[PDB]
Design a protein around this ligand. Sequence first.
Ligand SMILES: NS(=O)(=O)c1c(F)c(F)c(S(=O)(=O)CCO)c(NC2CCCCCCC2)c1F
Ligand SMILES: NS(=O)(=O)c1c(F)c(F)c(S(=O)(=O)CCO)c(NC2CCCCCCC2)c1F
Ligand SMILES: [Zn+2]
Ligand SMILES: [Zn+2]
Lengths: 261, 260
Amino acid sequence: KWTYFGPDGENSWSKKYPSCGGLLQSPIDLHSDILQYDASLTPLEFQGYNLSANKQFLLTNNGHSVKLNLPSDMHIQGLQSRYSATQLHLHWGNPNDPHGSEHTVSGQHFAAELHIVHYNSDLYPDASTASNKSEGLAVLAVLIEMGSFNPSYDKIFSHLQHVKYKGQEAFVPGFNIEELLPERTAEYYRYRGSLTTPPCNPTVLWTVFRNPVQISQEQLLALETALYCTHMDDPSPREMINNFRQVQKFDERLVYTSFSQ
Amino acid sequence: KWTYFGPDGENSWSKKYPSCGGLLQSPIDLHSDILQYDASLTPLEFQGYNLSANKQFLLTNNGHSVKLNLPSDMHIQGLQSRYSATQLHLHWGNPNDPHGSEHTVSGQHFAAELHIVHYNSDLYPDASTASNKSEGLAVLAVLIEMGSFNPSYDKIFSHLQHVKYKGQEAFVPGFNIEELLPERTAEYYRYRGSLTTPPCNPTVLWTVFRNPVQISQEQLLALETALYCTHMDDPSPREMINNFRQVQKFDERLVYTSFS
Ligand SMILES: NS(=O)(=O)c1c(F)c(F)c(S(=O)(=O)CCO)c(NC2CCCCCCC2)c1F
Ligand SMILES: NS(=O)(=O)c1c(F)c(F)c(S(=O)(=O)CCO)c(NC2CCCCCCC2)c1F
Ligand SMILES: [Zn+2]
Ligand SMILES: [Zn+2]
């Protein structure tokens, strides 16, 4: 059992999960000193993001986040191997401190962060297997701020109130995930990192888009209040909040940008 | 041992020291949402900070920072118990990313940070005994930014070449420690936290001053380049850099300010 608050909190993850205390840890603060423009950085292409509306995809509160499972036929192109979708999830903060992105940009926490997890399907038979292996994962990160209502994100946020507790499962009608991407996806930060949750394997190529998306005050509140980290039967409920890991040292590492300034 | 890097860096500190994976950990990001003004916070009074120019004080490279020993006559007034000085020390980054303050303000790392450690000498016989007890410590933080040369800080820095390796020591003549403090010291952040290094006891009354000081770029480069974590006879040597902890979750606590 690992949490984001307390003695089983992030500082103690290394105890049972050695990689959490290891190399190439994520997330990071995105700031000019570690940034380098790289003009070999080409736009990604997104394939099979348009999931059938006439089909439904499994949403899961896993006691640590709310995740939507995704079909392996959805993949990205523009990286070295094929990367096929496995899942998306979010991290966020709390109504007292609604700044719970994981990556930060010149020290600024955004409101929340959306992650779309892909695995290496040129090399590995699944995501689980790929996760423990080198260059085995690729994560897309969309920074989220407060602003206008977001009908596309609502396509997820409306099933929340019905997966409130640990282990619970429910169904979203398939939709076009590219709707969850920001403006100018060609402009992004790229670097080598790790899973931000136990077991923290250093196996992730991160792409964090330069531009954020906007969801409204109420959707943001909704996301921050809907879920619990605990089961239905648990005598000591815990609200699912602050489910972002703190930024990590970035020693001898560099973040590559597809954009100049 | 414990380091700021590698498999013995900060995310593994809790495997050696229970408190570093506990509550109320320092340092923290100083940002708008969690600041609460508190008109109750009166200016501290610094007693016995004008050290005798006629006395030498030990400056030690301990493999983690450079620390100057301070006399137990040196104390803070203004708090509920008397707090007496034990030492001061610093934290910093590296020439390639010269942002190594422990506290950040609105997410921004300053160049470096100066810490002046005190223990509660109304309750306890010394610092080490006080290190694990209620209301044990009060630490003063001074945020450091790169800029104008600072004569006073050079009263410490000018000696850096003498404490280059771990276990190495210089002697420093007394000057006024208050000269190290930024202006308007009445203006500060205040919160309950911990030691930023192992054993990380959650026994520190923190006071971070609002205003940064400046040191020159030469002065900061000396601090970033003179010192080593390893002994002189270590020919597999570690540079002393990035000797600061990442900011901690701080999300039931508030930080109180004395200014608006
Ligand atoms: N920010 S993250 O992208 O590194 C991340 C999470 F934050 C996260 F919580 C998870 S998971 O524990 O919720 C479970 C995945 O469905 C994964 N998942 C990865 C690691 C777990 C191995 C199997 C799935 C591969 C991705 C994950 F990748
Ligand atoms: N950031 S800090 O102000 O809490 C701090 C340090 F960063 C630090 F490095 C030290 S250290 O020089 O002694 C090396 C760490 O072992 C102390 N020293 C205090 C805490 C040590 C235990 C009890 C005595 C109080 C001094 C210390 F207090
Ligand atoms: Zn994630
Ligand atoms: Zn310190």
